[PDB]
Design a binder for this molecule. Structure first.
Ligand SMILES: *[C@@H]1O[C@H](CO[C@@H]2O[C@@H](C)[C@@H](O)[C@@H](O)[C@@H]2O)[C@@H](O[C@@H]2O[C@H](CO)[C@@H](O[C@@H]3O[C@H](CO[C@H]4O[C@H](CO)[C@@H](O)[C@H](O)[C@@H]4O)[C@@H](O)[C@H](O[C@H]4O[C@H](CO)[C@@H](O)[C@H](O)[C@@H]4O)[C@@H]3O)[C@H](O)[C@H]2NC(C)=O)[C@H](O)[C@H]1NC(C)=O
Ligand SMILES: *[C@@H]1O[C@H](CO[C@@H]2O[C@@H](C)[C@@H](O)[C@@H](O)[C@@H]2O)[C@@H](O[C@@H]2O[C@H](CO)[C@@H](O)[C@H](O)[C@H]2NC(C)=O)[C@H](O)[C@H]1NC(C)=O
Ligand SMILES: *[C@@H]1O[C@H](CO[C@@H]2O[C@@H](C)[C@@H](O)[C@@H](O)[C@@H]2O)[C@@H](O[C@@H]2O[C@H](CO)[C@@H](O)[C@H](O)[C@H]2NC(C)=O)[C@H](O)[C@H]1NC(C)=O
Ligand SMILES: *[C@@H]1O[C@H](CO[C@@H]2O[C@@H](C)[C@@H](O)[C@@H](O)[C@@H]2O)[C@@H](O[C@@H]2O[C@H](CO)[C@@H](O)[C@H](O)[C@H]2NC(C)=O)[C@H](O)[C@H]1NC(C)=O
Ligand SMILES: CCC(CC)O[C@@H]1C=C(C(=O)O)C[C@H](n2cc(CO)nn2)[C@H]1NC(C)=O
Ligand SMILES: CCC(CC)O[C@@H]1C=C(C(=O)O)C[C@H](n2cc(CO)nn2)[C@H]1NC(C)=O
Ligand SMILES: CCC(CC)O[C@@H]1C=C(C(=O)O)C[C@H](n2cc(CO)nn2)[C@H]1NC(C)=O
Ligand SMILES: CCC(CC)O[C@@H]1C=C(C(=O)O)C[C@H](n2cc(CO)nn2)[C@H]1NC(C)=O
Ligand SMILES: *[C@@H]1O[C@H](CO[C@@H]2O[C@@H](C)[C@@H](O)[C@@H](O)[C@@H]2O)[C@@H](O)[C@H](O)[C@H]1NC(C)=O
Ligand SMILES: *[C@@H]1O[C@H](CO[C@@H]2O[C@@H](C)[C@@H](O)[C@@H](O)[C@@H]2O)[C@@H](O)[C@H](O)[C@H]1NC(C)=O
Ligand SMILES: *[C@@H]1O[C@H](CO)[C@@H](O)[C@H](O)[C@H]1NC(C)=O
Ligand SMILES: *[C@@H]1O[C@H](CO)[C@@H](O)[C@H](O)[C@H]1NC(C)=O
Ligand SMILES: *[C@@H]1O[C@H](CO)[C@@H](O)[C@H](O)[C@H]1NC(C)=O
Ligand SMILES: *[C@@H]1O[C@H](CO)[C@@H](O)[C@H](O)[C@H]1NC(C)=O
Ligand SMILES: *[C@@H]1O[C@H](CO)[C@@H](O)[C@H](O)[C@H]1NC(C)=O
Ligand SMILES: *[C@@H]1O[C@H](CO)[C@@H](O)[C@H](O)[C@H]1NC(C)=O
Ligand SMILES: [Ca+2]
Ligand SMILES: [Ca+2]
Ligand SMILES: [Ca+2]
Ligand SMILES: [Ca+2]
Ligand SMILES: [Ca+2]
Ligand SMILES: [Ca+2]
Ligand SMILES: [Ca+2]
Ligand SMILES: [Ca+2]
Lengths: 387, 387, 387, 387
């Protein structure tokens, strides 16, 4: 076992080749499949795994009755191998959690699981499944984190947590974690910014997070930092707006775009110099569709011009959360950090006439060989027997 | 593989971080999940496992129809990974057993399984799954043991068994076991004392057991011993009474508290000099709620004053048996033995309108970082389809 | 990996300690559990496994509808860990088979699966799951074998196969197999003898098999042989008759006992000098109950006197097939070959009002420490939903 | 780990020994079993696996309802151990795919998964589950491949893909792949020939493919080539016609036989100098029955005489696709490449009154010891509950 270096740059890519699909909701009509939300992929030097929050209920069972917002004591962070349905019969237990992150430093898995009350929530940090630290709410207002993988460089792993309002100024903290112990934390000085559900990746020994502004930004806010947590902050300038909901594309802003700014969806983007790969919904008002767009000046430019769009999910199909994951050279044998992404395909409430809400997943890795746009939707026929 | 040393002291702890929750009963509404009682957790130097008794029946099937106590020939000791539901598909067979203990010496698993008739029961010991010894009832009155982990120091493992009345003076024996072979046993001189279902842990090369007085004590009895089985006996002195049922808290006794003394519940406590961490129900009459209390003079002092209370399950929620487990420095990399505990959340008979009784579980580990009290209950909606 | 030596003698034992119980039929009321017949245990130097024939059907499903004695093209030899229910989700595929054997030489599993037509059946031999030989019917009349483990000594494994009538003189052959290749076979000159479903074990570098006389013997026939297949033949002399059906106990014979001699059940016995451990049914007429009996002169003496009887299943409870298995020193660390046995607990047709027949199992290992008689029966409540 | 050499000849075989049967459809009447098509077997130096396509539906659930051809975005390539039913609980995820191949080079698995639209489909190649290359449709007319194992020689793996009409002249390409990277391809000059669903095996450092002419041949086309993709082409000359449908056996052609030539079924054959082992349906008009025929001059000779016929499935039983797999000396210890085959037994829509179509499988390995003909059919009783 060797620590992931994290020192090479992101692989430049021309397109997205499909990596996995689990069909969880179709299979869970009869099989023993967890009700899940907030899946996310993360890889070691040896395998990739799907992390997810269950409510400890199976599809098509009465205990699946529940909403998109549910911070219950039943919620657990579990994992299974990529592209398998999340079943009690193939799922590793990670942590008790209604908000989570995980990443592998090259030696062992770090998991971060937040549970307890809204006014006093506690992150439990595990390294190789052993409790190595805790951090408690510092604003008593729903301590919460990424719902996607943390990022590791030379034996240190990094994440972002928020505490405070989801509809106003909140507090945002960045963490350095070694062997599951918090060795440093900084509060981000970010007045008029809002950071939720960050997607964070390593690139040339430094961390870039693209997050959700739930307050008043229909473009995505970003924070980047070195191993000492010295940070820079901004918003993606492109008039190709990243969030959902959002206005139609037009001139963008390097600060928060207020038009359709309130509310949002977890997402991601990859910075390449002044350019940006944006994953976003195809609807401006609803979690429907998904597409990747290459905007060669979209990190720092405000025009709504782009070079590449690749269809992932069709406009009339359910999408949901999306997030980054990487494959390090230690896993791939490449000379660069390969960017990948997942999409959560949400079914049930509140858009559909069911008692339950659950997600399946699809994922894609960046390549420079030939790719094709299509639609890989969830595919389940709702409602189910239990409804 | 190395023998666990067992020679460091218990880690000092200020509170309890949530470690696992399996949601067994909620998931067994649809999936193939054992009807279980007496889960307990025990760790090798590489992983932690939930040990449990089943009667060879699944939830929501007619064979779940049961009686509250039953030493049946169908009962088996099985184990699955911590936090996972106990299923026929993920569970390892250990022993034919209606009473049990297990613990890892650092080299292999010891399992103790008692089966056979009430007038002549036999404990089958296995080391690495191979039978290495038997011991038969010496009073012909339900030979029985811990229903939690045995304790290991330098290649020896230690347990307590009882044979005799559950409602009067019984016989209590301590055992030293090496590679699954009983090498020494001593009968306790304990007139007017009653020891049931001990929770035993190692601390500085000695074992401390906190147990259940089912005859006439609402405080918990204890027995501590060295590797040569030289022992000391007592009752927890604290006015914070530990058993269920019990009176409201008042002046304690260093002998058995006769008030509400009959009957009881399997529990645990951790000694720190004159102090004690007590785990107990929140209800004085029934197996409802759970709380951890730090009483800094409660091992040896009789007042009802305490310094810390941490909510685990709310008073209106089902609880059940509890017990100690530890994480040895060989697993954690710490310089001390880490105290942890599990709670069984019992659903069904006799309190609810079902044909069956079954438990899910929660566990916590002692830490010195920030923690919080909450309620993590079972969550199942009873009755079930089969009822 | 080292070849099992097979050169020590059987461990002398005073009694039988319970080792496993799977409760398959109780669990298969709801769980995904194969319909099975002909289970048997066999061990490597690292684990013990249950081998069994499925008919490619699950309990409580319409495909379980059976004849109750059928050599179908659906029948497969599979295995799972001892004490686990045989499910599609935990079972290794071994071979296509309506009659089978398996044993581990210390390096790899040998499996023997017989399939095809009654007039031309073929045994497929596999070593490490690779086909290494075949042998075809030489009498064109149901080629068939042990339904229990073969026996291994110093890199050679040995079995017995029958071809010919089950109600008359037939042909009986012994086989030496190395790395799954038949290196030698001998036909047993055995006029007026009948050998079916042999239980064969190693002892001091030689093989002893105790079998079923289905023609005209209510005592069990035996054949012992060295590594060059030079054999001796006989019948167990004890007036403690071993087969089912059988007459009441009385003066035995060193040849076949014709009284109630037709038909039989698969069984076993362990030879100790002039003495014998007999496992048998408790009923003389029906596959009900099971007991172990120590007859210190029963191998070679014809009286009906014995020293020890140990109850295993009550007389009013269904039993069935039983067979030997051993644990070699390479698995146990002992200086002798440990004798163990299994019992198949048959449920359904023809004795019960179901469309199906399926068995669960129990197993026991010989010890010289204290043991106890009891009843460990199947425990299922028939009929099932499908009936 | 060592590269498979692939330089020895095919083992000489006199007949076929049954290797596996999974009973998938029978078991899926109650258990959680994928709806599957296009099963195929492929082996590493350590084990053999069943690869299969599913549509992300289980048997006896409503999502099993579908069409009989369909390149959906729900279809995934998955693998389980050979002879086990393909379940969500025992199946590894490989790739998003409605057409596929896989093979092990001795170091890692290669997997080829084609997904995307009919006018621009993309093959995603993975080595050890990591994307290593893609290739896009070059005729925009359903890029498709083998649906059986690719073939490996000295660290290079070889496959065939087709792009173009299924009912007229198409384009056929051969690929050389190293560590999941295409290092060379050639387009075959094959006017008036048609290649579909190739069954490709290594023999003496060269690859031979026997395929399906869906255009105008009832005899099978073949293509052989060296590591430099220098190729030769031809049809099997035998008047024992290999495709389904086909005419009654008569004088063959070394070119395509137009009588009954349109349409076809995936199959295989093994070349031995001028001779051929032919696997075919027993019916000339439908996918019913299966038989193995040795025709000692059938590769190059046009007579309808043969030396050996071995029954596999009876004429009144459902069969389906078949393909080749091999066991290299590195797995078996032999000095030659062992030829095996699998048959899909397809059940359901449209010949039967079900909403679904799904298969079980059987496989055999070539031996020179005694074998026997029989029928090992699917055995499921349709229709099912969901129908
Ligand atoms: C097996 O699959 C069969 C084929 O079904 C297709 O594939 C499946 C897997 C699905 O993708 C399915 O949607 C595909 O059609 C399936 O046959 C199908 O059966 C369904 C359900 O019975 C039919 O759907 C219903 O159609 C009627 C009639 O629609 C026409 O007429 C009305 C006027 O009366 C118009 O308003 C429509 O525009 C159509 O022109 C509808 O009345 C009905 O609506 C009800 O449910 C919807 C949900 O959207 C509600 O919102 C409404 O209020 C109604 O309550 C359904 O849409 C479908 O036509 C049919 N397809 C075909 C091709 O025949 C078969 O049942 C399946 N077998 C089994 C055992 O499951
Ligand atoms: C506590 O015990 C450790 C470890 O002791 C060793 O391992 C045990 C399983 C057992 O077999 C012991 O007898 C072994 O000695 C002690 O560390 C050892 O101390 C000795 C003497 O100082 C030294 O030679 C070894 O190098 C040490 N072994 C290791 C692995 O560090 C430790 O000193 C004891 N701590 C106390 C008494 O608190
Ligand atoms: C019983 O056999 C053991 C082991 O024999 C070895 O293992 C066999 C499978 C086979 O490979 C033989 O060739 C081996 O000799 C005997 O112990 C061995 O004895 C030999 C001869 O003295 C000695 O040189 C080896 O090193 C021994 N190996 C071991 C591990 O002890 C033993 O003598 C035999 N009989 C008894 C009852 O002990
Ligand atoms: C068949 O191949 C074997 C093995 O060849 C080696 O491994 C292959 C995977 C490939 O990487 C080759 O380059 C390797 O040579 C041949 O055996 C080897 O032959 C060489 C040359 O004679 C010799 O030095 C090695 O000792 C051999 N290795 C072994 C394991 O025998 C073999 O000669 C080849 N030819 C035939 C027809 O069998
Ligand atoms: C703005 C981010 C954050 C602000 C509190 O809100 C999130 C918004 C959601 C959405 O926009 O869909 C649903 C999320 N979520 C997670 C769970 C249970 O684990 N239930 N809701 C929710 N997070 C939390 C921890 O509540
Ligand atoms: C006071 C200890 C003891 C005296 C015999 O009584 C226990 C109390 C129980 C309770 O207070 O709930 C239920 C337990 N239990 C276990 C099983 C079978 O595993 N059925 N009942 C029981 N144990 C035994 C061996 O019977
Ligand atoms: C006398 C032995 C032998 C003579 C043929 O008969 C056995 C007797 C049985 C009984 O006494 O119960 C049941 C067995 N059995 C095995 C299977 C499964 O393949 N179905 N029945 C049967 N074996 C065979 C291969 O048919
Ligand atoms: C002639 C080859 C080929 C030309 C396109 O046609 C195949 C023929 C089939 C048959 O003859 O049975 C059924 C196959 N198949 C597979 C799936 C699902 O992935 N749906 N159809 C089909 N393959 C493809 C990729 O469509
Ligand atoms: C990238 O880093 C390489 C590996 O560095 C070594 O491994 C890491 C995990 C640390 O332990 C570090 O102290 C070691 O030096 C370098 O060897 C290499 O020079 C670096 N740069 C590039 C782009 O290759
Ligand atoms: C639940 O169980 C009651 C008793 O069952 C009986 O005792 C058990 C141990 C078995 O021996 C069984 O065969 C006996 O019938 C029943 O009286 C009761 O009706 C059952 N309850 C339900 C709701 O099924
Ligand atoms: C399901 O959810 C609703 C909340 O919208 C809750 O009030 C209701 O009681 C729940 N139903 C059941 C059966 O638990
Ligand atoms: C990475 O971490 C190691 C161990 O702390 C440190 O000594 C080393 O200098 C670091 N390397 C780089 C490139 O920062
Ligand atoms: C621990 O066990 C070993 C082996 O029996 C023994 O020699 C040693 O003295 C023990 N160590 C201590 C400190 O007790
Ligand atoms: C069992 O199988 C037989 C033979 O096919 C059939 O006649 C009978 O109906 C079946 N019984 C049931 C209940 O399915
Ligand atoms: C065991 O087997 C080997 C042959 O493989 C032989 O050389 C040796 O003599 C045998 N050992 C004994 C009989 O101890
Ligand atoms: C096999 O591959 C190796 C590695 O590239 C090459 O050097 C070698 O010559 C090849 N061997 C043969 C027999 O073709
Ligand atoms: Ca927003
Ligand atoms: Ca732009
Ligand atoms: Ca009490
Ligand atoms: Ca006090
Ligand atoms: Ca007989
Ligand atoms: Ca006698
Ligand atoms: Ca054709
Ligand atoms: Ca010919």
């Amino acid at each position: 076992s060797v620590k992931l270096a994290g020192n090479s740059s992101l692989c430049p890519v021309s397109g997205w080749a499909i990596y996995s699909k689990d069909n969880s909701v179709r299979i869970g009509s009869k099989g023993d499949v967890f009700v899940i939300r907030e899946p996310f992929i993360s890889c070691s030097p040896l395998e990739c795994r799907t992390f997810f929050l269950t409510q400890g209920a199976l599809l098509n069972d009465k205990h699946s009755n529940g909403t998109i917002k549910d911070r219950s004591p039943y919620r657990t962070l579990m994992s299974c191998p990529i592209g398998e349905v999340p079943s009690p019969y193939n799922s590793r237990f990670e942590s008790v959690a209604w908000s989570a992150s995980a990443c592998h430093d090259g030696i062992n898995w770090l998991t971060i699981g937040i549970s307890g009350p809204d006014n006093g929530a506690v992150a439990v940090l595990k390294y190789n499944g052993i409790i190595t630290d805790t951090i408690k709410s510092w604003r008593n207002n729903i301590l919460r984190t990424q719902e996607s993988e943390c990022a590791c460089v030379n034996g240190s792993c990094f994440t972002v947590m928020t505490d405070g309002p989801s509809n106003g100024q909140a507090s945002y903290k960045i963490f350095r974690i070694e062997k599951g112990k918090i060795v440093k934390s900084v509060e981000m000085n970010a007045p008029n910014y809002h950071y939720e559900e960050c997607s964070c990746y390593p690139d040339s020994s430094e961390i870039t997070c693209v997050c959700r502004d739930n307050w008043h930004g229909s473009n995505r806010p970003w924070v980047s930092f070195n191993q000492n947590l010295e940070y820079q902050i901004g918003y993606i300038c492109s008039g190709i707006f990243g969030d959902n909901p959002r206005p139609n594309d037009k001139t963008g802003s390097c600060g928060p775009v207020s038009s359709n700014g309130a509310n949002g969806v977890k997402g991601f983007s990859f910075k390449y110099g002044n350019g940006v790969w944006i994953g976003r919904t195809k609807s401006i008002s609803s979690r429907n569709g998904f597409e990747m767009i290459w905007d060669p000046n979209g990190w720092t430019g405000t025009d709504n011009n782009f070079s590449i769009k690749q269809d992932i999910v069709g406009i009339n199909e359910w999408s949901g959360y999306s997030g980054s994951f990487v494959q390090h050279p230690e896993l791939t044998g490449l000379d660069c950090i390969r960017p990948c992404f997942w999409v959560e395909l949400i079914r049930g409430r509140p858009k559909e006439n069911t008692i339950w809400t659950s997600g399946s997943s699809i994922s894609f890795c960046g390549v420079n060989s030939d790719t094709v746009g299509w639609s890989w939707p969830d595919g389940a026929e709702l409602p189910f027997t239990i409804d």
